[PDB]
Amino acid sequence: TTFRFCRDCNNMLYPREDKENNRLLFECRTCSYVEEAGSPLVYRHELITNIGETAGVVQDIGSDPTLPRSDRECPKCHSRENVFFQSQQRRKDTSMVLFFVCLSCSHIFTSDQKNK
């Protein structure tokens, strides 16, 4: 949703209707700091979330020994070795599709077929 905070008192900013220009305008609720809105979006809700399935990837993810290795093609290095793990989205209905991190380029690529 890309929320922002006030730069005067470090508090939240809320959307506000305008009349002279009929435009969205973000304002503070305790110091009345006023600025424009970058996007009309003000609230997002994910019934089905696609992000977060690859969360926790770190540049030294390969140092984890418990993480298994594979030799599937890397479509940025064409290298063999990489680390693979299933979806981190722990919902009971998630698909078992794997994800792969290359130890040379750190590009995350999955084993899906519909997306490709």
Partner 1 sequence: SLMSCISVGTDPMPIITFLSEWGMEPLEDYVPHQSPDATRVFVNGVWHGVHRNPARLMETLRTLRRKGDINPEVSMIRDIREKELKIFTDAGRVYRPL
Partner 2 sequence: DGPTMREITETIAEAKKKVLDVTKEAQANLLTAKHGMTLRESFEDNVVRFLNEARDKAGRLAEVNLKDLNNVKQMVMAGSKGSFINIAQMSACVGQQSVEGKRIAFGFVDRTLPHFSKDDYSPESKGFVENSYLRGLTPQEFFFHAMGGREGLIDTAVKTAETGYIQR
Partner 3 sequence: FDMGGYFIINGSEKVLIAQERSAGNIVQVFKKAAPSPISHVAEIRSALEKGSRFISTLQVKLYGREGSSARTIKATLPYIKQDIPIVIIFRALGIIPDGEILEHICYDVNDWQMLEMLKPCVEDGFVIQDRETALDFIGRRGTALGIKKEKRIQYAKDILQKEFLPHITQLEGFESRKAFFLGYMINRLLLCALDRKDQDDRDHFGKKRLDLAGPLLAQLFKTLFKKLTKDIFRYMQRTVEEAHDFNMKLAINAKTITSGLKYALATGNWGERAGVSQVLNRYTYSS
Question: Residues interacting with partner 1, by CB under 8 A?
Answer: 56, 58, 60-61, 63-64, 88
The entry of partner 1, Zn ion, partner 3, none that residue 33 binds, CB within 5 to 8 Å by partner kind: Zn ion
Beta bridge partners of 108: 101
Consult the annotation and say whether 28 binds a ligand.
yes
Beta bridge partners of 35: 26
Consult the annotation and say whether 6 binds a ligand.
yes
Secondary structure letter of residue 62 according to DSSP: G
In the shown chain, the binding pattern of residues 13 to 52 toward partner 2, with x for contact by CB under 8 A and - for none, equals ----------------------------------------
Q: How many CB atoms lie within 10 A of CB 82?
A: 25
C-alpha angle 36/39/40, rounded to 5°?
A: 95
Strands across the sheet with 24-28, in order?
13-17, 24-28, 34-36
Indicate which single residue of 99, 100, 102, 109 sits in contact with Zn ion (rule: CB under 5 A): 102
Q: Does 52 bind partner 3 (CB under 8 A)?
A: yes
Residues of this chain that bind partner 2 (CB under 8 A) = 66-69, 84-86, 92-98, 111-114
